[PDB]
Structures are given as C-alpha cells and as structure tokens.
Symmetry: C4
Subunit: 251 residues, 4 copies
C-alpha cells in the first residue's frame, strides 16, 4: 500500500469512530435518548473496534496521533509517515463531526431554542461537549492532565500487549479486545475528563465547533487556562509513558 | 443448495431477525419493559448475528435486499437469484411481524383501550412504530434519506471488510462482529430514522401494519410525502455507495 | 465418562445456570438492585454459557430436558441416558434454588414484612416469580403455550446450527453464542412468559417454592388452569418442532 | 521470567483491575454517573480480563491470593513463589486505590461537604465502600462468609475449566470468558457482599481507606465482628473447595 492509500484509510478510520462516538453523544444530548455512562463508553469502544477492522489491513489502524508517535518512537514506525498519518487523523475527525452535525442539524437548533442557549457563551459549552471533551467542574488543568496521561498509558500498554506475536491473542480478536478496553476506561474515568485518549478525536471536532459558531469557548471551555492543551499533549505524554513501561516491565 | 433451499433460508433468516427486533420493541411499548437506546440496538444487532449463523451455510445470509443488490453489482452475485432472494426476504419480514403481533395480541389492544388510541389515526403512528421505522419529528424526507444512505453505506463497507479472505477475521466471528456494528449504528443514529438499513425489515412489517388496521398512515407515517420511500430506496442507494467506496479506497 | 459422571455434570451444570439466573432476579426483587429487561436476560444467557463451558466435555452440556428429548429423537442420543439426564437436571435446578434462597434468606423475610405479604396467597405469586416463571396477566394458557413453543423451537434450531461441523463456528465460541441467543430471546419475549425454555429451570424451583411455604399457588400461579404445565410440556413440543424444522429446511 | 519479573506483573495486573473497578464505583458514588448492578459488574469483569491479557505471558495472571493458594495446593504451583505473589497482589491493589483516590480527590471532598459526612464515622462507611466491599445490612458475618465461599468456589472451578487443554476453549478467549463469569457473579450475588472473591482486592484498598482517614471503621465496617475477615479468609476457603470439587467431579 502506498502512502496515499494509507492516509485515506487513516482518514476513514478516524472518521468512522468519531461518527459513532459523537452520534451517540448527540442522541443523548439533543435527541432525548436514554444513555448511561457504561452505554456511552461501550459505543465509543465498539466504534473503535469497527474502525480498526476496516482499516487494519491497509495502514495498521493507528487512528490516534498519540499511538502513531509512540509506535514511531518504540516500534520502529516510519518517521516519513508520522506527519501525513497525523494530518489524516485530524482531518477525518473534523469531517465526521461535520457529518454528524448535518444529520442532527434540526435537533441542535430545536434544543437551543427550547433552552434559550446562545451559541458561543459559557452556558453553550455543554452543547459543545457533544463534539469534544471538557473537564469535570471540580478538577483543574493539572488534575485533568494527570487523568489523560494515566488512561492513555494504559491504552498504549494494552495495545502493545494485544498486538504482539506469542501472547496467544488472535489477530482477528485483538480489535474487539481493544474496544472493550476503551469501554472500561471510559466507564471508570470518563466522568473526569471525557476519556479523550486521542488528540485527533478532540482537536478535530473542536475546530469544527469553533467554526460552527461556538467561537473561543470551544477551545478554552470557559476556563482561564485553555483546556484544549490537555487532550492535545496529555495523550501524547501518556502514550510514550505506557509504551516505555511495557517494554521495561512486560515486553 | 438449490434455489428453493436458499429462498427458504432467506425467508427464515429475515424472519428470525424481525422476530427478535420487533419483539423487543413491542415489549418496550406495550409490555412495560424498560429498554434504553443501546439495549434496543444491541438486541437488533445480536438478532441479526443469530440469523446469519443459522442461514450462512445455505444462502450466504444476505437477509437484506440492499445487500443482495450490492453483492450482485459488485461481488458477482448471480442475477437470476436477485428477485427470488428479495421476495423471500420481504415475505419473511411480513410473516415474522404477524407472529410477533399474535403473541403480543392481548397487550396491543389493552394498550389501545388504556390510552384511547384509535387504530388508523395519526396518534396511532407511534404504536405502528413497533413494526416499522418512522422519522424523528424534527427531520424531513430529505434529511431522513441522507441518514439512511450514510448508515447503510457504513454497513455495506464493513460487511465487505469483515467477509474477505486475508483480513484476519475468522469466518465464525464475522457474524457476531456484523451484529455489533448494527448495534452501534442504531445507538448513534437510531433516534433519527430508526436505523432501518434494510428494505425488507421496513416494507414487510409496514404491509402487515396496513393490513392489521392502521391503514394508509402505516405507509405515509402522518407526512405529506410518504415516508415509506426512505427505508425502501435509501438503503439501496447507500449500499451501492458503500460497496463502491470500499472497492476504491480499501479493497 | 460413565453414566454417574455425566449425571453429576448435568446436576452441576443446571444448578450453575439456575444459581446465576435466580440470583439476579432475587437481587432485583428483594435486594433493590436496578435491572432492566435486557440486563436480566443477558445474565441468564451468560450464566448458561458458563454452565456449558464447565460441563460440555463430560456430558455434552444438555442442561435442558427439552434439548435432551430432542437430541434423543433427532441426534441419536442414547435412550438409556434420557431418564437419568432429566432427573439430574431437575435435581440441580431444585438444589440451586434452595441455595439462592438460603443466601437471600434475610432479605426475603424483610421484603415480606415491609409489604405485608403472606406467603401462600395470590399476592405472594410475584415473590414466587423469583424462582420460576409466571405468565403475563393479559395472556392465558393457550397464548402462553404458543410463546413457549416458538421460543424453544428457535433455541433448538440454533443449537443444532451452532454445534454442527462444517458451519464454521469454533467449538470454543459456540457456548458463548448460545448464551447470547438466550439473551435476545428473553429480551424480546421475556415479558410474556418469562422465557423458561427449560422444563427443569421451571419445575425444579417450583417444587422448592411449594416446599418453601408458597403452597399450591406456586404451581397454579393464581390461575384456574395450573400454569406449571406450560413450561413443562411447552418447551418439549417446541424443541421437537425446532429440531424437525432444522433438519428439513437447513440441515 | 525471573521471580522479580513475575512479581512486577502481578503488581501491575492486580493494580489494573483495581483501577478500573474502583474507578467505576467512584464515578457512581461521587461523580454522579448512572450505573446499574449489571453495568458495575461488567466493568469489574472486563477490567479483570484486560489485566489477565496484559500479564498472562509473564506470571500466569493469578491476580488473586485465593487463586494463588489454590493453584499451589492443586495445580503444583511453586511454593517459593506463593508469598511474593501474594505480597505483590496486595501491594498493587493498595497503590491502585491511592491512584484512583488522587484522580477523584476533589470530588470526594465535595461529596463529603455537600452531605455533611465526617470521615471515620459510621455514616462514612458508604463512602468507604468505594474502595472495599461491605456486607448488606440484613446479612451478618456467617451469611457473608457463606456467600464469599460459594462465589469463589464457582470462580475457581470455572478458571480450571477454562484453562485446561482439551476443553476446546482457545487460550486467547479464556481471559475474556473469565471476565464474563465475574460479571454474572457480581450481577447475581453482588448486592449481598460486594462479590470481593479476592483477598487482595479487598484488603489492599481497605488499608488505604484506613490511612486516608476512615480509621477503624474501614476494617470493621460498623459491625461488632470485624467484617474484613470475610473477604480475607472467605475466598481462600472457597477457592480450595472449588478446586477440590472440580478435580473430583469434572476434572
């Protein structure tokens, strides 16, 4: 597979997981669907598994800039493909957020008119939480960064544990096992930071929310310190830590 | 296997998935069962997986006219079997809707008498939603068609991705993975159009609802433009788009 | 394996599935646990899968008199083992119901004193529904028998479909797939008759409920026609129909 | 693998399952997350499966002192590694409880101030139930011990049933099947004693709760007889019984 073919697969794979994840959150927020914390988390994980199954044979199904950087540093992934892979991942998440917004277009405006929410204000951040993740009100930037580092380290460590020959896990079952890992992470740590674990999953839809009319509050989240840095660099630091720990303690 | 044997398998396979899907919706609506959006979606998906496991060895387990048309256009499926397969699929969905109605017969009339609902009126469309799918009140024909096209394209693309040699997915695990894909599609996009994704799944029970006493509102759904066209031609267009995209970008 | 060894495995396997199924129903009824229809059904199915995994290698993991009779009539199962297998299955369900009652002993009496329920009365049938299945108030004996026949036919047909060489289903994955089939059956048809599908699962705990103090209402269920016949002979008729249909239409 | 390498794997594996299990309970209690009994149980089980997948190749993934003792007595596990394995398991559960407390630090104090709960009192035992298990108010020490013995015997018996060559279960699917077994055990027996089934899972976080400020009530649980003995010796007795029963009746 050429570089162009793998970039398209990364674009489609990241878009597919964003389409399922944002869609279910949109259904809970503006469509009146009844979802619990476990149900939302299991939709995110299974959507990732389907995205991996679709694009594993072409590009390896990274679908995460943090995973792409960690693989380059620790799994001898080609450095020439690092930038195009990351660009394709963010582009796929951005376009998928636009597609979900288009399908839920009439419900978003009906929700705003009913609750008298003006887009771009602090009170509109909750609606902006459909696309991207925002921290719990009781935690700050430092605690939010620690949560993102820890959960991404677990994800990176288990990905290496589930995708190494000799561990007994079939290659056909590994994508499903990865999705279940994301579900329990989101179920146990989601109410804190939104279990982003993916710079593309957060930055992409955040750019669309800024263009959709939410303005600066899409990036800052109503906080003095702009929150968008936590899902951007937090997973990157955590992925490196998780990959380093696995090679030292398990691998 | 002869053509008659495959048609019977398609009749039973489509009926089995309708029996599980309509039954769970009936339990939520007239039996007082507590179901969320994810729970309803996961029953639909797992019911499809069981139907595929039962009939895969005989007819290939299409169980969807949109999939049958897409396979004929892109997977060299025999054209002589296209019409009998589609006829058997719609017949199976029709008979299964009648069977579910017979088992839930006393609960349907008790529900109508309690809520003073006259069958065949606009207020009875919600009860008619047990058998077939109807759009969200905030979306119209054009947006409903777009939703059905997109979700069927994802289903068709993943079906080809999950049923090709060399992708590493075992043949015994593919039917279960297909069902999980339907669950997340229904969880993320269900509150919009009912995630029909299957012309037989919608048209079949719709004909029974018309015969059961709902009349013309079973097809139109209380809309000026008859809604039944969206689940009829929407999945067909989406399946072709999804199959074409997979061959160009992934396959 | 000798006959004594297989009878012990059938005794333990049926007891294990009753222990999980009755325990979760007891938690919902007297322990205040929050369970939906899907959640209860998925506990029953997964408990059956664990029971099959434990006893498949010894006795074949029938754990159902209806399945045992159907296998003898259609799968050349030994007739000399039919009676001891059925006796062991009912004995295992009876003892497991007693064990669950012992663990939940203090909660059952606290529930009765709080709600002023006298054991053995018509108002105590709901508490007796913890151990065995009772019909929906809007359905009668004839409709209850039809529901039990249909769902057991689907279970028997899929069991043959999931346990035949050449269908591509691994032997290690078949028990889990069987449990998921039970979950969707209970989710879609449970609110009607309790998805017994197993004469031992119902008759066994019913005998214990009669001995525990519920008296005659444990068998009759407060109905003029004794309801206990429906889960006794209903699954037996359905299992034969399902096995016959599979051999004629699929097998 | 040397003894030091296996001890680290046991430390990380037990910590990983505690991180997921305590985190989801913390989200339900202090973060306002909506969780049912099945949802909490399925997070515990799947977290165990991920922990097994990470550490099976190094130390065998015991992650339970009761399992370690049972394997030494019945599976010829090395006696020299029994003490270091148990020490590592309790250490991992202790550190993971501290990590979860640190991430949820601000939410715990906000919950206490809102409800006017003084740490170390009887009314604070419910908050202490986030880390460790405490019995249902209607059951006493004797019934709590019986529940822990029975459920651990089932877990030990199924673990031997799922990890023996010749049973047809793939080695890659066994960890997932073990997690599903824990989910149904917690769903059916959790509202009684908290389905500890693991001396490290309970004693470890209990020591942290005592150090975190809960004092003596973390061990006694507000009972005249200290409850901490039930999850300590209960699973050990049950694991031996379950292993002995499997070798006599199934193995």
């Amino acid at each position: 597979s050429t570089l162009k073919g793998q970039c398209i697969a990364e674009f489609l794979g990241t878009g597919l997981l964003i389409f399922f994840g944002v869609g279910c959150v949109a259904a809970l927020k503006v469509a009146g669907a009844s979802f619990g914390q476990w149900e939302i988390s299991v939709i995110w994980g299974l959507g990732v598994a389907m995205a991996i199954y679709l694009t594993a044979g072409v590009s390896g199904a990274h679908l995460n800039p943090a995973v792409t950087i960690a693989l380059w540093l620790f799994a001898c992934f080609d450095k020439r493909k690092v930038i195009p892979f990351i660009v394709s991942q963010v582009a796929g998440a951005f376009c998928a957020a636009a597609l979900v917004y288009g399908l839920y277009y009439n419900l978003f405006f009906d929700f705003e008119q009913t609750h008298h929410i003006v887009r771009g204000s602090v009170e509109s951040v909750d609606l902006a939480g459909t696309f991207s993740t925002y921290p719990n009100p009781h935690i700050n930037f430092v605690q939010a960064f620690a949560v993102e580092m820890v959960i991404t380290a677990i994800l990176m460590g288990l990905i290496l544990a589930l995708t190494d020959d000799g561990n007994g896990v079939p290659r056909g079952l590994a994508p499903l096992l990865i999705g279940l890992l994301i579900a329990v992470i989101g179920a146990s740590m989601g109410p804190l930071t939104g279990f982003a674990m993916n710079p593309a999953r957060d930055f992409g839809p955040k750019v669309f929310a800024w263009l959709a009319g939410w303005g600066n509050v899409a990036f800052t989240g109503g906080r003095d310190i702009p929150y968008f840095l936590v899902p951007l660099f937090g997973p990157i630091v955590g992925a490196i830590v998780g990959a380093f720990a696995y090679r030292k303690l398990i691998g």
